[PDB]
């Protein structure tokens, strides 16, 4: 039965990645006064399959300057982790109940960067190396605030488990007490994915494609789908932590429904933002995260350390 | 337990062997040092969990703290070395023979 559950958790995520590429294109088109794919199928529901099939039908590249081992490992790892981050998620019941699920998320995400690093290094092209170093800077920038934001939120949950947030929000979202932390977490998830305005790892206007510039159809598809999967993942994280779906033990289907609605909202917001803003300079990202988010993050961490004490609202350990 | 500890000790010894037997690059030796730190952290955590002594878990985290501080100052010295000679080679810092 567990393998069937694996399927019911995996194949829909990939279909959703594909139709997320679709929704991205169509939303950006209508924002840009254009339509977006409507030719390939009814309103374009076959463009993703066309793209994927076409890519996995193309000649891949085995250049002469590359370390083929890492060149091939990196996309494998990217996709693997993009799919593995979805397992401990409660919707409302997870496939793998982990007590330290938050830390699993953190570590797997911090690991997904090495796909970019090793790809850009192996490719042995200057633009690839530039994308890799930009990823290094981006991680060094956001990873400090990520964990402190998350700790400050969890100090009212009582644990690193993703299933106690459901009982924590049983009456009221965690956005009201933590909307500053929610905003900073939103932007930091925006950065974790190398997504606009932080699309610096593949900045087409400075670096033709970054770490992808030597990669070709299949591996490139792997990278791309990993990106568009981590997008949905981080939206789901935002909407399990700060937004709380209705949990009535006799009605988990409503929980899944509302979870999906909120995830769609947050993802469409990601696309909105890509369409609405220019791109940062990768030094300004560091300056932001280290001069506006980290000081405030420490202040709020102290605030949420104290609040349970001068309120007697310390959470329980299971 | 005993086989685990034997293998972790052998691993510490291999990393120490690497640290002692230099090659051109210095960062490789720093990485061998970090590997020794890893071995020791793991050994200590395993011992504390086998003994159920939850009063000694604060020790390995301190191990990691100080190991990373050592790594930081090593990287800074590496920066200075590269600025001086343009490379992190060890065969270049041999002028204190007098």
């Amino acid at each position: 039965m567990f393998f069937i559950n694996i399927l019911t958790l995996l194949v829909p995520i990939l279909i959703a990645m594909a139709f997320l590429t679709l929704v991205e294109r169509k939303i950006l088109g209508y924002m840009q006064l254009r339509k977006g794919p409507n030719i390939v199928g009814p309103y374009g529901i076959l463009q993703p399959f066309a793209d994927a099939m076409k890519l996995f039908m193309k000649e891949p590249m085995r250049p002469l300057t590359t370390s083929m081992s890492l060149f091939i490992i990196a996309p494998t790892l990217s996709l693997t982790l993009a799919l593995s981050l979805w397992v401990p998620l409660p919707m409302p019941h997870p496939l793998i109940n982990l007590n330290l699920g938050i830390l699993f998320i953190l570590a797997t995400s911090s690991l997904s960067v090495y796909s970019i690093l090793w790809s850009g290094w192996a490719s042995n092209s200057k633009y690839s190396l530039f994308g890799a170093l930009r990823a290094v800077a981006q991680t060094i920038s956001y990873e400090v605030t990520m964990a402190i934001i998350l700790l400050s939120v969890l100090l009212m949950n009582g644990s690193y488990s993703l299933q106690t947030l459901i009982t924590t929000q049983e009456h009221m979202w965690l956005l009201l007490p933590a909307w500053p932390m929610a905003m900073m977490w939103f932007i930091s998830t925006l950065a974790e994915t190398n997504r606009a305005p932080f699309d610096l790892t593949e900045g087409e206007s400075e670096l033709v494609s970054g770490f992808n510039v030597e990669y070709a159809a299949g591996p490139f598809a792997l990278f791309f789908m990993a990106e568009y999967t981590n997008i949905i993942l981080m939206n789901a994280l935002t909407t399990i932590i700060f937004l709380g779906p209705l949990y009535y033990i006799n009605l988990p289907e409503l929980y899944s429904t509302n979870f999906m609605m909120e995830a769609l909202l947050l993802s469409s917001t990601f696309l909105w933002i890509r369409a609405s803003y220019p791109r940062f300079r990768y030094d300004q990202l560091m300056h932001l995260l280290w001069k506006n988010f980290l000081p405030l993050t420490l202040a709020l961490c102290m605030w949420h350390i104290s609040l349970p004490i001068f309120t007697a609202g310390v959470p329980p350990y299971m | 337990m005993p086989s685990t500890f034997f293998n972790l000790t052998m691993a510490f010894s291999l990393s120490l062997l690497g640290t002692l037997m230099f090659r051109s690059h210095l960062m490789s030796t720093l990485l061998c040092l970090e590997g020794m730190v890893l071995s020791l952290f793991i050994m200590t955590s395993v011992t504390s969990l086998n003994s159920n002594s939850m009063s000694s878990m604060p020790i390995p985290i301190t191990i990691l703290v100080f190991a990373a501080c050592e790594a930081a100052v090593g990287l800074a010295l590496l920066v200075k070395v590269s600025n001086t000679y343009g490379t992190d080679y060890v065969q270049n810092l041999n002028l204190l023979q007098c």
């Binding site: 102290m302 104290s306 001068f310 007697a312 310390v314 | -």
Partner: protein
């Protein structure tokens, strides 16, 4: 100084907020009357078994039964 605080609140409000929240976090515990209850709650939780004692016959203050009206009551936590 008010003008300095003002031009900072206009220019660099993020550090103003940071210092303010720092100070409030450090202060409010000294201010609230619900601060004493944190340790009382974390002490009220029976994470272990309440090992009983031998009735030497000289423990008047100690109960012979859970529902015997003796010992620490948790009403202050039942209506808080």
């Amino acid at each position: 100084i008010s003008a300095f605080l003002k031009n900072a609140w206009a220019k660099e409000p993020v550090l103003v907020v940071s210092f303010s929240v720092w100070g409030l976090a450090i202060i409010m515990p000294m201010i609230s009357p619900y601060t004493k209850y944190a340790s009382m709650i974390n002490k009220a939780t029976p994470y272990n078994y309440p090992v009983p004692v031998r009735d030497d016959g000289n423990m008047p203050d100690v109960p012979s039964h859970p529902q015997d009206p003796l010992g620490p009551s948790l009403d202050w936590l039942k209506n808080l």
